[PDB]
Design an enzyme around this catalytic site. Sequence first.
Site, PDB file in Angstrom:
ATOM      1  N   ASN B   8      15.236   7.063  17.490  1.00 54.24           N
ATOM      2  CA  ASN B   8      14.049   7.871  17.467  1.00 54.24           C
ATOM      3  C   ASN B   8      14.127   8.712  16.190  1.00 54.24           C
ATOM      4  O   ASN B   8      14.804   9.735  16.132  1.00 54.24           O
ATOM      5  CB  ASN B   8      14.010   8.722  18.733  1.00 54.24           C
ATOM      6  CG  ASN B   8      12.768   9.548  18.834  1.00 54.24           C
ATOM      7  OD1 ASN B   8      11.891   9.476  17.976  1.00 54.24           O
ATOM      8  ND2 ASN B   8      12.683  10.368  19.890  1.00 54.24           N
ATOM      9  N   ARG B  72      11.077   4.449  18.551  1.00 53.77           N
ATOM     10  CA  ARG B  72       9.788   5.152  18.755  1.00 53.77           C
ATOM     11  C   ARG B  72       8.844   4.941  17.573  1.00 53.77           C
ATOM     12  O   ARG B  72       9.213   5.219  16.447  1.00 53.77           O
ATOM     13  CB  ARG B  72      10.035   6.631  18.922  1.00 53.77           C
ATOM     14  CG  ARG B  72       8.717   7.371  19.089  1.00 53.77           C
ATOM     15  CD  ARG B  72       8.917   8.806  18.890  1.00 53.77           C
ATOM     16  NE  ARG B  72       7.739   9.544  19.354  1.00 53.77           N
ATOM     17  CZ  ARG B  72       7.575  10.842  19.158  1.00 53.77           C
ATOM     18  NH1 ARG B  72       8.492  11.564  18.480  1.00 53.77           N
ATOM     19  NH2 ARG B  72       6.487  11.445  19.624  1.00 53.77           N
ATOM     20  N   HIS B 161       2.548  11.035  22.631  1.00 52.31           N
ATOM     21  CA  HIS B 161       3.496  11.407  23.681  1.00 52.31           C
ATOM     22  C   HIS B 161       3.272  10.593  24.965  1.00 52.31           C
ATOM     23  O   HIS B 161       3.711  10.989  26.059  1.00 52.31           O
ATOM     24  CB  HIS B 161       3.467  12.902  24.043  1.00 52.31           C
ATOM     25  CG  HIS B 161       3.897  13.814  22.960  1.00 52.31           C
ATOM     26  ND1 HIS B 161       3.195  14.960  22.671  1.00 52.31           N
ATOM     27  CD2 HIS B 161       4.970  13.804  22.144  1.00 52.31           C
ATOM     28  CE1 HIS B 161       3.807  15.602  21.694  1.00 52.31           C
ATOM     29  NE2 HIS B 161       4.901  14.934  21.376  1.00 52.31           N
ATOM     30  N   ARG B 222       2.525  22.789  13.777  1.00 53.00           N
ATOM     31  CA  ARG B 222       1.168  22.274  13.715  1.00 53.00           C
ATOM     32  C   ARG B 222       0.158  23.214  14.338  1.00 53.00           C
ATOM     33  O   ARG B 222       0.419  23.840  15.376  1.00 53.00           O
ATOM     34  CB  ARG B 222       1.042  20.935  14.446  1.00 53.00           C
ATOM     35  CG  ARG B 222       1.302  19.746  13.544  1.00 53.00           C
ATOM     36  CD  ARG B 222       1.420  18.433  14.290  1.00 53.00           C
ATOM     37  NE  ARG B 222       2.801  18.245  14.719  1.00 53.00           N
ATOM     38  CZ  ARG B 222       3.218  17.342  15.597  1.00 53.00           C
ATOM     39  NH1 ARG B 222       2.371  16.507  16.191  1.00 53.00           N
ATOM     40  NH2 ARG B 222       4.532  17.250  15.869  1.00 53.00           N
ATOM     41  N   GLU B 365      13.442  11.278  26.527  1.00 54.04           N
ATOM     42  CA  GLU B 365      12.623  10.388  25.719  1.00 54.04           C
ATOM     43  C   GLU B 365      13.390   9.104  25.387  1.00 54.04           C
ATOM     44  O   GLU B 365      12.868   7.993  25.522  1.00 54.04           O
ATOM     45  CB  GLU B 365      12.191  11.120  24.444  1.00 54.04           C
ATOM     46  CG  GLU B 365      11.461  12.446  24.697  1.00 54.04           C
ATOM     47  CD  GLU B 365      10.013  12.288  25.170  1.00 54.04           C
ATOM     48  OE1 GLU B 365       9.338  11.333  24.761  1.00 54.04           O
ATOM     49  OE2 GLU B 365       9.553  13.126  25.960  1.00 54.04           O
TER      50      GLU B 365
END
Lengths: 375, 376
Positions: B8, B72, B161, B222, B365
């Site tokens: 990832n 990912r 996500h 962000r 994840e």
Amino acid sequence: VTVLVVNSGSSSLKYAVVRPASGEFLADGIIEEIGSGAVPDHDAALRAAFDELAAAGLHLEDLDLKAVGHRMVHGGKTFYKPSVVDDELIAKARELSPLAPLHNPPAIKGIEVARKLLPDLPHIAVFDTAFFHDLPAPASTYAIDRELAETWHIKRYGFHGTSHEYVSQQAAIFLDRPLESLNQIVLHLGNGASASAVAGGKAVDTSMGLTPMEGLVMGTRSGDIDPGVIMYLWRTAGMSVDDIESMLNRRSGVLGLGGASDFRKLRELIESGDEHAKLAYDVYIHRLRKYIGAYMAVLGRTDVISFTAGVGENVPPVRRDALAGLGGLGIEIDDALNSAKSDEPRLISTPDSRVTVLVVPTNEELAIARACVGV
Amino acid sequence: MVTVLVVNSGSSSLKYAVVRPASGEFLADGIIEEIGSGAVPDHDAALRAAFDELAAAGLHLEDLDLKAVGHRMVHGGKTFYKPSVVDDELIAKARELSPLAPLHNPPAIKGIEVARKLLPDLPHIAVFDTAFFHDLPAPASTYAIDRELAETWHIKRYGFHGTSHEYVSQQAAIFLDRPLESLNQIVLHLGNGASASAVAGGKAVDTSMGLTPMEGLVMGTRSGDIDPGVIMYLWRTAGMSVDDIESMLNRRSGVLGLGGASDFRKLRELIESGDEHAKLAYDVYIHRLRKYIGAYMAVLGRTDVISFTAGVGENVPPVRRDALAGLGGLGIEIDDALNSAKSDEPRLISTPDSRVTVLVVPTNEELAIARACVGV
Ligand SMILES: Nc1ncnc2c1ncn2[C@@H]1O[C@H](COP(=O)(O)O)[C@@H](O)[C@H]1O
Ligand SMILES: Nc1ncnc2c1ncn2[C@@H]1O[C@H](COP(=O)(O)O)[C@@H](O)[C@H]1O
């Protein structure tokens, strides 16, 4: 006291002669299709309004005219209170026209012709931002570089403030409950569309932004959009920043997605089986549902939701569809009440609805008139 | 038992794990950080360093029944969303789309590139953030812009996500011993990136990120949601290039840009020290989050469960408290004691009187990626 009210938009010019104390209207009208053979510019438009007044037997020279009130959308940081118009104020409004390109320019032209025809009265600008001046910082501060924001005075201003203010006051009165005791949502659904959250008479959130581009889906405006879309249209579709802005302001909303010049036409298109129109409607409602839920969360307890402006006042299905399926949030529409033919402030929720839902017509002309008094 | 290596690859870090997807056992896990200079100039060097760490820990990949390497990938556009065996076509598409996910697509491509050099004889699989959202209802994914322009340029809400939103929605149902198809849920992925979803009977019906990961919640660096007029003003008046505005919104915004905090732990530390800027940034973050929760309750109409996940969601009780405080009128009541007690388990944090059930459901994840590799 008697006031002439001018709302000079890009395509039409609304006018009224108003006695603010009593609220009585001596005349009102709209000059439409500015750019026509008969009314080619805003100067022609105000002159035509004066012809209609004359034609009705109203002669301003016999009236007690104390001021001319104008709608101005953006005054930036410097002007938000009702303000006497002078060259300074006009210069700032012009500077700020690119923040409100559909509204500030024709408003200024309205002022320009009015000051030529009535040079010896005070002209007062009444600003869309005023009601939102004291928004809480967590509601008005974008999550950007703080130094940059403050350097360029970037914050949420909000617009349609005279409508949100007027309607929130009038909903309290309709319910005979104190304004300070009520948590309210106001949905101004017109050509421009905005929501507000009002906590005991004070605005705590609203959907438009630094500019009138943020929030709900509108007649020709996108409302909320991923900033990444702008970057992509510039980078990959090869559109200039001005052209992207133009598209978002003028070829978006119900028109751009649905093909409809205005909301009456859209509903007609849907009735005729137009799938594009139906999607544009469903997108409009989906956005509106999200703002209503969002603002219920901001308020915590919500006492009243009120619909207003052209669509809010006149289109039962919007009100039904915005609120359908929200029993678990304490909201239930009475369909017979919602469908009633009526132009009056009125209840549209059922007796057991925990949240009271109203239609409360906007009266911009009365609001501007009253805001002129004493300035 | 079958084993998968998970890679990832983010802008400045590379997370790796060796996972058995059936049991969920991790044989190893780690992260290479500060990629971009010094001993780890790039992601090629980073994955090699990961391999050095595996060796240092006594792990030898050649001794394992390694079946695949999972990666990912944030954006695959229209063409790639299902878990996909990596080939040149897929890489070329991910590269084409990189400016839509500049923090994520480029480092992930670089991670694939080195991984294929180190492990040439294994299938490399891309697992996409957008998959769970492929079938969003059109009224939720269609922006209100010029229809023909949108269609030509493939503009729509993709969402991201997805693997976490998917995983948490499944695990919330399992935790509550209720059918996945019976529940209307909100999932709050509150990490370095942050996004919300609304899930009706297992199917996503809304989510907060957009065509790109720039829309929605306030995040680490962000901005999330912003008036498009602000972008136009920064270009027109502040004289910033569009690339520089985008960089600012992606890298110098959020809790960092507003609060001066490099991450959420630091943010809370500043607040406790009396930093007014950090407090305002936290209050902006909570305000936005509350609005998305309320919004998605209106989308679902009836909400059965709200679940928090990812770094902040799992580990910061005050965010969960402040996001949901004062919502008794919407059927929500947090149990402060349950919310405060430290745990790493899926768990209830709402009171018995709460109409809406509130959970913390951790997502691993890397585990989710490894699992998606099986049966590709
Ligand atoms: N009776 C009506 N039915 C449908 N739409 C209406 C009606 N009256 C006004 N509108 C819409 O409201 C918008 C203008 O609202 P406003 O900006 O408040 O004047 C336009 O889209 C009109 O088509
Ligand atoms: N125990 C914790 N306390 C406060 N913040 C945390 C904690 N653990 C992780 N975070 C934050 O979660 C964010 C990253 O989450 P993720 O992207 O899911 O790794 C960072 O801002 C971290 O500082």
